[PDB]
Every structure is written in C-alpha cells, then in structure tokens.
Amino acid sequence: NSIQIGGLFPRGADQEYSAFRVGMVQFSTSEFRLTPHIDNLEVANSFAVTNAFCSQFSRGVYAIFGFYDKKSVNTITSFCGTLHVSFITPSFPTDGTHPFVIQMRPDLKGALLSLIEYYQWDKFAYLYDSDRGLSTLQAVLDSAAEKKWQVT
C-alpha cells in the first residue's frame, strides 16, 4: 500500500532535505509508507516550478511537498486551487486565502506586532529584502499609522 508524494526541493536545501529524509523514516508504518518523487529544482523560476508540478501530476501523486518563492508562489496556489491537488510546504504564508495549500510556517507577522508593543518603540529602522518578500513589512507599514511608528 505504498503512497506517492511530490517532493519539490531547491538545490541548496541540504539540511531541509536531510530532515525530510529523516521525517519519512520515523513515521512509516507496517501497512503503508510514502514514495516521494524528488525534483531538485531552482524554485524561483516560475517555468521550472510549473513544469515540475506537472512532472508530478502525470506521475499521479496524492499530495506535493515543496517550497516556493515570491515569484513562483502565485503559480502553485492557483494551480492547486483548480486541479484540487493538495500542496504542503514550509515556505512563507500565502498573502490571502488560497485553498488546497498547507503552510507549516506559522504566521510570523502576527507575533512581531506584539513584540514592538512590549518594548515600547516609536522610531526605528526596518530592513527587508524584496527576495524573501515584504508581506511582513507591509503589515508593519499598515499598522504604522494606528500605533504611531516612524519606520525608516
């Protein structure tokens, strides 16, 4: 009763995969297991991800574990939304509600707002990389008016 799963891993993900490989071992039972198809791909390229997602759809997996990037994120969300494929990933949470998506990464933006309150900050600098995204920076700039912040 072997069950197949999609495995989308970036190239440099050595420990992420090292922990993934350990994950399946500690959880496989005597009546079923997991048969992942691992595609080491450059996750930023939307075409590579799109071509890789279908490389798993034709193989007929029952769920896909992977990652995504600010550029390729909207590629996976609407793809799993129409094909009813279930996608599980630790990449950053979807900006909005996108169905058939499982985000292990807990919402970091909600916790950061509470930290700045206890420290009683008023003016500070916010450093962000447009690569990782800015969904968290957007949140602190939105609440910058209600809570009196002068973000540089």
Q: Which residues bind a copy of itself (CB under 8 A)?
A: 44-48, 50-51, 54-55, 70-72, 74-75, 77-79, 81-83, 95-96, 125, 130, 134, 138, 141-142, 144-146, 148, 150, 152
3-state SS class at 118: helix
E strands, the chain, in order: 2-9, 33-40, 64-65, 87-89, 101-103, 123-124, 150-151
The whole-angstrom distance between residue 90's C-alpha and the CA centroid of its chain comes to: 4
Q: How far is the CB of 27 from a copy of itself (least distance, A)?
A: 31
Q: How far is the CB of 144 from a copy of itself (least distance, A)?
A: 6
Taking the least distance from each CB to a copy of itself, the nearer of 21 and 147 is: 147
Taking the least distance from each CB to a copy of itself, the nearer of 10 and 81 is: 81
Taking the least distance from each CB to a copy of itself, the nearer of 96 and 106 is: 96
CB-CB contact of 39 with 53 (8 Å): no
Q: Phi and psi dihedrals of 4, rounded to 5?
A: -95, 150
3-state SS class at 65: strand
Q: How far is the CB of 87 from a copy of itself (least distance, A)?
A: 13
Taking the least distance from each CB to a copy of itself, the nearer of 115 and 145 is: 145
